[PDB]
Amino acid sequence: LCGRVFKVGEPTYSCRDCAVDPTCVLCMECFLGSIHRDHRYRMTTSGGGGFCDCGDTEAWKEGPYCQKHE
């Protein structure tokens, strides 16, 4: 699993099509290797803290894993 903890200023990505709720997010590496880069995504700059949800089926209605972690 990715598990990346976001640092100050780091971009986080959600998918408006696949996220189960708005707290479901991916780090940049997982987002760019995921199906969601072709979807309606939303980038929010992190203030630090929280973690990447790559791999969590309860976080994503489709495409829970990126190509690196699948």
If one asks whether residue 24 binds Zn ion (CB under 5 A), the answer comes out as no
25 vs 50: CA distance, rounded Å: 9
Among candidate residues 6, 7, 2, 24, the one with its CA nearest the CA of residue 15 = 24
Query: Near Zn ion by CB under 5 A, which window of 6-14, 28-36, 43-51?
Result: 28-36
**Residue 9, beta-bridge partner list:** none
- Judge whether 39 is annotated as a binding position: yes
Contacts of 48 (CB under 8 A, 6+ apart): 6, 7, 8, 9, 10
Which residue in the set 39, 46, 51, 56 belongs to the binding site for Zn ion (CB under 5 A)?
39
The residues of the shown chain that bind Zn ion, judged by CB under 5 A, are 2, 4, 15, 17-18, 27, 30, 36, 39, 52, 54, 66, 69
In the annotated binding site for a peptide, the residues are 51, 53, 56
In the annotated binding site for Zn(2+), the residues are 2, 15, 18, 27, 30, 36, 39, 52, 54, 66, 69
